Amino acid sequence: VKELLEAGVHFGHERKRWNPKFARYIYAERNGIHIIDLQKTMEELERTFRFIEDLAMRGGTILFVGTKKQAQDIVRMEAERAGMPYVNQRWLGGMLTNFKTISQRVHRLEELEALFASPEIE
RNA sequence: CGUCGUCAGCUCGUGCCGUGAGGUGUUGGGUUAAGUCCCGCAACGAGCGCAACCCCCGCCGUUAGUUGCCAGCGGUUCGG
Ligand SMILES: [Mg+2]
Ligand SMILES: [Mg+2]
Ligand SMILES: [Mg+2]
Ligand SMILES: [Mg+2]
């Protein structure tokens, strides 16, 4: 089931504007583009989900992020459809790193979310 | 109290960069009388200033009538 899907049309990307480090994950250069080695891909997918799974079963929250348009929307989906936090817009600086302070706004959100429905609006 | 000048400015908390002094925020794009507002952005917010909150001339109105007026009829020694 896996292979086919990928082999379908989900591999090989950026061309000639790479990074040599990532040379361990790549099959060849067809007509220009770098054809990533899926064979290896798979192997990695494993260990990855292993981790995900070995975490999704222990009450752990994950944070997804994708600020690029050719991938915004979807990320918005898969997140709500899992209750896992996420970032689709401008990934503020110091979120994780200055959480306590960024949170301050989250609180300001409800601060208004509440004043939204109220007689003080009169 | 006077001056730069009512000029649009000066800073702070945290995060981040930097050996550090210090940066970033407050560089960039449009606009404005304005650090005014917007959109951008390793920044996210905030304070003192700006503005607004205050008084005046303005339009109109309600209450109140010893200023006022043949304004309406009025008597009037002829000046409300
Ligand atoms: Mg700082
Ligand atoms: Mg340091
Ligand atoms: Mg500093
Ligand atoms: Mg200001």
Curated annotation (Swiss-Prot):
Spans the head-body hinge region of the 30S subunit. Is loosely associated with the 30S subunit. Belongs to the universal ribosomal protein uS2 family. Part of the 30S ribosomal subunit. Contacts protein S8 and may contact the N-terminus of Era. This is Small ribosomal subunit protein uS2. It comes from Thermus thermophilus (strain ATCC 27634 / DSM 579 / HB8). The gene is rpsB.
